Structure 1
């Protein structure tokens, strides 16, 4: 690794302190007094303290006046030697943040007449914009430093289609980088692209969503969803697939958009659609990736587009997909990754303002609470601005309906509340939730947007890992089993989840209100419910396993809270035992439409459970207080849980509702809390077309759910 040759080193580690490092074998030569120099300036430096290091001797110096950024600084030793003042830790100080915070817009501001380019690079001494265009003249123009560390330049002419890169000079080293706010990029996101507004017209206006507990979330990956040969969709693994109406499998079973609509889901959650690394857009079939390797936060991923070479195309297709879903009454949730970037060292953040956008440990090294290399320092003011900017942009430009925050716990609460204010204002009713894991990132525990602090984040939901493990079984231990798999030890936790996880007797609340509990038993992470259960119950036949998985769905779908379903879960999706399929082949990750046909009856069961939920508000109480007033547990045994919803006068169409979950293949009788005749709406066999009436007792035969209801 080559480098600029320098006599000694000097860094601005704080607004008024300069650290001078002198190579050991020069300690007696390059000695103090040290002076700071710049055009029009030459001041003395006071040595607060000095001490030896491995191969260098250090001097912690103080300056009477705070360092002025944007200009090259020289520090001279008494020996006459000099070196350029480099950037130190000063960038991560509150003082530095308050001095340079910029509240204006950044990026490329286009007009048919001219484009204004702006980049925040407070610690830099120079910046320029590099313009290029297919078969055209390339030009690089110096940018001017304005207030708040912002560099800008106005380029006359119509820049539509022009590619651009920023050149930022930090510590006398120029780095080339894509605009952090790039809203379009070239294939494989190598350069940003300036594009005129595409005049997209949203023709499927939707009123703000009623309430979180009224949603049914369906998590899917754009490639997985339609890549299968029998998917019935033409644009396999592309944005346009979901725009295809009335598609069906070879045997005639509904597929794609029609399928999703038919299931009764309200929100389709998509894995990362912003540009990420992991798939060569030039050869999309040669590799696969979930997409959790952020490159450009304001631009779409190119492998899902019909043509990744034409900058506007991916934008057009993602917007059409979203508008079409809306035309069909479906809403969209975007999985976003503001907790880290792919390859910190070469990221736009690091190349523009070194050390600013990432958290560091006490030793000065990048923290790794995310476990993937770096943690975005959301608490830094321009980072908080970026995240808020990004969320509002996706809402305004792509008209989405919510966001699932990957590693939500890595973000700081103030940032979360700040973006929430801006996001809900731009789009009333949107869903905002994520995995509030308490991770080892350098933030005080009460500042982490973790589950534990849910009480301070009203309007933000969290994946309920407790309810997940209670029903399915511990996720960390393959063999561990949950209530649905026959473990009576988790019956109470399950009942707690059924009640919205907002407190149950001796059990402390998981979240304050049910609107904040994302109830699920499967997601793209870890083994699918089918594969997990297959390892935990190696001696159980497929038929029984199917009943257990259907049981887990009924528990979640008939539970207070916000139901979440992993795509393919409805038909026992399997990944061949793969635990973490982030980069596995399509054979592993594709949505198996053949399996969808095979278990069309099971899929139908979950469809009925969803319709049941939608037709009865009793399952969608809006507060822990209302739940305490209409839900009560009637029986809690190792393999049997019976609860009921009552006093539903102005709540439900039905006067009383009883739900019994049985997790054992044996048969048992269950006494009702009264002798009034009820309607047998469902049993382990599934829903009954013509509900028979039963009295005093009811048979509970095998694994499954029985539902009784009293009309009015």
Structure 2
């Protein structure tokens, strides 16, 4: 409120002291001034820097306002208020302080007054407006020139909208659909409509996606999991791929530049010159429209590492604000690398915890988002690295060097979190995860863990989940289903039956392996208290093989990632069904058509929550590449042409199976099935094969009202005759048979089958079903429905 001394300019009035809360740029409700607030415990000086867009493009600042360190600062939070500020300016911060390479008494200090760094709380960011657009060709690294390189030009943050109104939600609320009801579709914003066949107005944008959303409503999906939509740099490592005319993009976006700003290069409007805040409203429009169609939005989020990399990466934000607070560091200043990406965010140090939590609440409150999937979630359980606060000489006024550079170490010099835990140690009770799990703003927000990291920490089945608040990507489900369905000796039959049940062997298991450290110690308290809906089941996802390719290649084919690449999963549990890649051998193609459906049957006929990889609903292929992370091409694009074509009726199959699952409450459970819910069979009723050599799993599943389903997967290379369990006064009726050419693979009424067609196809087999016999082809899958016995069935149609 008081003036802090800095003079007015053409763009704003005399600066005021301002307030530390809220962090970020906000409008003062009293004066209308923009209050600016940014944390840094390590900075000696801080300047607010403002840009016109032209100045920003040119690598030049328009205005600089030095903050008074006595008046424009409260504790570790710097703050200043600028009244009557031109609201089309953009902002950042020049932060001066020590640097370890210029004084080694200060490991972990990495200030650079030549940089202008981004407000971590930036509501929208501008740097480059169009996807793939290179930044300007400035003489970077010279006096007064802002930005790092053409791939990393100067970014700036948008100001709060002073005049004008907010977005009209029209009563929109997050849907709060019960977790167990979900069918999740993993999609990429750009890849969903970037392909020419998409036919939309703004290909590859938030606005483009809205235009094709009816597809996903028609497909029967009720949740979309978006790949990272937080601002990232797709030109991060832009270079020509060695031995190829293609260029290397960071396509997927698992390398976040700013966590509060939506990705501008997914915004049609920003691409066309709109103000940077336009992307905010384009994303709000998208969520609104997903909700109109009964589709939840789950954001994939990456709080385990940032785009700044290690010391050889760019100073964009955290590193130049306060490197010691934001990143996991050893006492020399080296970056712990549990993320496998160069740095590891300091998740559980207090300011960082608050940042992440504020970020999640921001996306829920401002964008009405329904859930978060946390990439490499194990990192969020690890103890942070602490440093003592900087000492200053009262006489000299000067900074005072400390023992071990002020790293809080053990007697053996090992980094510690300040409270006795060695840095990196996985916590039974991580404060961040507890905060996420218990914050009231997030209480109806779904939380999904990918419960491992890149240093071999694996917490699946015992992520700290605070009373059922977290589901987990179930990678065991993926490997089990792939092994069993291709036909593989081992324990895969038993393991598969368990997967059908929602993997209670993983989520309700209270007898950990003797060698599993986590499950025996920190994870033990978390080994129960969850039902099947904690298992996010998937057969494929953005990384790894597609469904089609899983059934077409024994080995990966990542040549397009560049000569001398060592990219992608080695152990794929795949089978090419006879020949590597495309082939005219008919028995191969017959088998692939079947195994696509068998794998999908497994996914959507299991308790827990199925996730579908974009494109696997129509047999999308990446030509055997199991790691398309760098390709801005058809390999990562939804192929609207191939979808229309549906040559062997697979998209119809998937679509109908989705809808059939949604309509079957016995598959959508919050408690595990018991011996009265499900019974196991073989070729004979109640005689399951659990042996190493098993090639058959089959089960009945009751609907609670006397009806129910019979399901069987024959993974044998031989055909089988099944004896069906006899239910008094009832017969089994055909629905799914993967041995049948489409549309008779799925006998449901639709635009292709009439109610007559279906009844006729049921009556055809009436002699087989009445006998309680059903013939099944090798590598095939059956679903039957129990119906009231009607002896007139076997008379004339």
Normalised-by-shorter TM-score class? 0.7 to 0.9
Q: Show the counterpart of 2:487.
A: 486
| Aligned with residue 499 of structure 1, among 494, 498, 501 | 501
8 Å CA contact retained: 1:115, 1:159: no
Which runs of structure 2 are paired with 1:455-466 in the superposition (5 Å)?
Answer: 458-466=468-476
Deviates more, 1:596-605 or 1:556-565: 596-605
Which runs of structure 2 are paired with 1:269-348 in the superposition (5 Å)?
Answer: 269-279=225-235, 288=249, 289-306=251-268, 307-308=270-271, 309=273, 310-344=275-309, 345=311, 346-348=315-317
1:110 equivalent in alignment to 2:110: no
Residue 121 to residue 602, structure 1, CA distance change in 2 (3 Å): same
8 Å CA contact retained: 1:416, 1:449: no
Gaps of 5+ in 1: 1-101, 245-255, 473-481
| Aligned with residue 639 of structure 1, among 687, 695, 703 | 695
CA distance in 2, matches of 1:135, 1:700: 69
Which runs of structure 2 are paired with 1:186-335 in the superposition (5 Å)?
Answer: 186-188=126-128, 190-196=155-161, 199-203=166-170, 205-206=172-173, 208-244=175-211, 256-279=212-235, 288=249, 289-306=251-268, 307-308=270-271, 309=273, 310-335=275-300
Q: Show the counterpart of 2:659.
A: 611
Q: Show the counterpart of 1:119.
A: 38
CA distance in 2, matches of 1:524, 1:264: 20
Q: Show the counterpart of 1:388.
A: 357
| Corresponding residue SS for 1:582 | coil
Q: Show CA shifts across 1:441-492 (max 9, x none).
A: 9xxx7xx8765435656211111100100112xxxxxxxxx11112243122
Residue 103 to residue 340, structure 1, CA distance change in 2 (3 Å): farther
CA distance in 1, matches of 2:651, 2:247: 32
Q: Show the counterpart of 2:531.
A: 513
Return the offset for 1:279: 3.9
Q: Provide the aligned length of Structure 1 versus Structure 2.
A: 578
CA distance in 2, matches of 1:457, 1:301: 33
CA distance in 1, matches of 2:174, 2:80: 41
Deviates more, 1:594-603 or 1:149-158: 594-603
1:575 equivalent in alignment to 2:622: yes
1:132 equivalent in alignment to 2:51: yes
8 Å CA contact retained: 1:521, 1:552: yes
Q: Show the counterpart of 1:585.
A: 632
Residue 286 to residue 147, structure 1, CA distance change in 2 (3 Å): same
CA distance in 2, matches of 1:456, 1:428: 12
CA distance in 2, matches of 1:128, 1:506: 55
Q: Show CA shifts across 1:34-83 (max 9, x none).
A: xxxxxxxxxxxxxxxxxxxxxxxxxxxxxxxxxxxxxxxxxxxxxxxxxx
| Corresponding residue SS for 2:116 | strand
CA distance in 1, matches of 2:95, 2:676: 61
CA distance in 2, matches of 1:534, 1:508: 38
TM-score under structure 2 normalisation? 0.68
Residue 154 to residue 363, structure 1, CA distance change in 2 (3 Å): closer
| Corresponding residue SS for 1:609 | helix
| Aligned with residue 338 of structure 2, among 369, 374, 382 | 369
Return the offset for 1:533: 2.8
| Corresponding residue SS for 2:553 | helix
Residue 488 to residue 357, structure 1, CA distance change in 2 (3 Å): same
CA distance in 2, matches of 1:313, 1:151: 28
CA distance in 1, matches of 2:591, 2:370: 38
Q: Show the counterpart of 2:84.
A: 157
| Corresponding residue SS for 1:660 | strand
Residue 135 to residue 374, structure 1, CA distance change in 2 (3 Å): closer
Residue 502 to residue 450, structure 1, CA distance change in 2 (3 Å): closer
Residue 508 to residue 521, structure 1, CA distance change in 2 (3 Å): farther
CA distance in 1, matches of 2:638, 2:619: 11
CA distance in 2, matches of 1:687, 1:508: 41
Q: Show CA shifts across 1:273-331 (max 9, x none).
A: 11101249999x97641111211111111221122443022122111122111112211
CA distance in 2, matches of 1:507, 1:415: 25
CA distance in 2, matches of 1:110, 1:207: 26
TM-score under structure 1 normalisation? 0.76
Q: Show CA shifts across 1:624-682 (max 9, x none).
A: 2x556512322344222111212613xxxx62221111224532111122254222222
Q: CA RMSD in A?
A: 2.9
More strand by share: 1
Residue 135 to residue 711, structure 1, CA distance change in 2 (3 Å): same
| Aligned with residue 426 of structure 1, among 441, 444, 452 | 441
CA distance in 2, matches of 1:621, 1:419: 25
Which runs of structure 2 are paired with 1:547-696 in the superposition (5 Å)?
Answer: 547-599=594-646, 601-624=649-672, 626-627=673-674, 629-635=676-682, 636-637=688-689, 638-646=694-702, 648-649=704-705, 655-664=707-716, 666-674=718-726, 676-684=730-738, 685=740, 686-688=745-747, 689-690=758-759, 691-692=762-763, 693=766, 694-695=769-770, 696=772
CA distance in 2, matches of 1:528, 1:107: 42
| Corresponding residue SS for 1:338 | coil
Q: Show CA shifts across 1:424-447 (max 9, x none).
A: x33554321131115439xxx7xx
CA distance in 1, matches of 2:639, 2:90: 40
CA distance in 1, matches of 2:328, 2:676: 46
Gaps of 5+ in 2: 1-18, 56-60, 100-111, 129-153, 240-245, 382-429, 513-526, 555-574, 580-587, 683-687, 748-757, 789-797
| Aligned with residue 95 of structure 2, among 168, 178, 197 | 168
Residue 339 to residue 629, structure 1, CA distance change in 2 (3 Å): farther
Q: Show the counterpart of 1:62.
A: none
| Corresponding residue SS for 1:535 | coil
Which runs of structure 2 are paired with 1:527-538 in the superposition (5 Å)?
Answer: 527-536=545-554, 537-538=575-576
Q: Show CA shifts across 1:522-550 (max 9, x none).
A: 10011223223322334151221121121
| Corresponding residue SS for 1:583 | coil
Q: Show CA shifts across 1:360-392 (max 9, x none).
A: 247642111111101111010111111101011
CA distance in 1, matches of 2:679, 2:465: 24
CA distance in 2, matches of 1:632, 1:373: 50
Residue 620 to residue 566, structure 1, CA distance change in 2 (3 Å): same
CA distance in 2, matches of 1:103, 1:643: 62
Q: Show the counterpart of 1:65.
A: none
Which runs of structure 2 are paired with 1:3-22 in the superposition (5 Å)?
Answer: none
8 Å CA contact retained: 1:293, 1:341: yes
Residue 535 to residue 643, structure 1, CA distance change in 2 (3 Å): same
Residue 362 to residue 156, structure 1, CA distance change in 2 (3 Å): closer
